Amino acid sequence: LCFTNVYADSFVIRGDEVRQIAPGQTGNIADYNYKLPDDFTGCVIAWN
């Protein structure tokens, strides 16, 4: 594929808290620290 632009965001969160990193989710991370668009297109990559 081809993309007009790519943005790489990074941060450190709890292991069980990665569930909150997804479109339209609710919670501490999903609301007050990092929120993704509901129609977000991209990839989320996490590891311990």
């Binding site: 997804a22 479109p23 339209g24 989710q25 609710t26 509901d38």
Partner: protein, 49 residues
């Protein structure tokens, strides 16, 4: 009519589902109601003829 959705009340499904999951059920409801309106329009056209 539920049209296969968990509930026919949109606020209910909005409250009890996340947007990713609520979208599919809202699409089902939208399709059902649009089809009902299409059928009503077709029947009205036949009656008008």
């Amino acid at each position: 009519s539920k049209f296969g959705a968990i509930s026919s009340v949109l606020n209910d499904i909005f409250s009890r589902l996340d947007p990713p999951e609520a979208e599919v059920q809202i699409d089902r409801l939208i399709t059902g109601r649009l089809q009902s309106l299409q059928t009503y329009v077709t029947q009205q056209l036949i009656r008008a003829a």
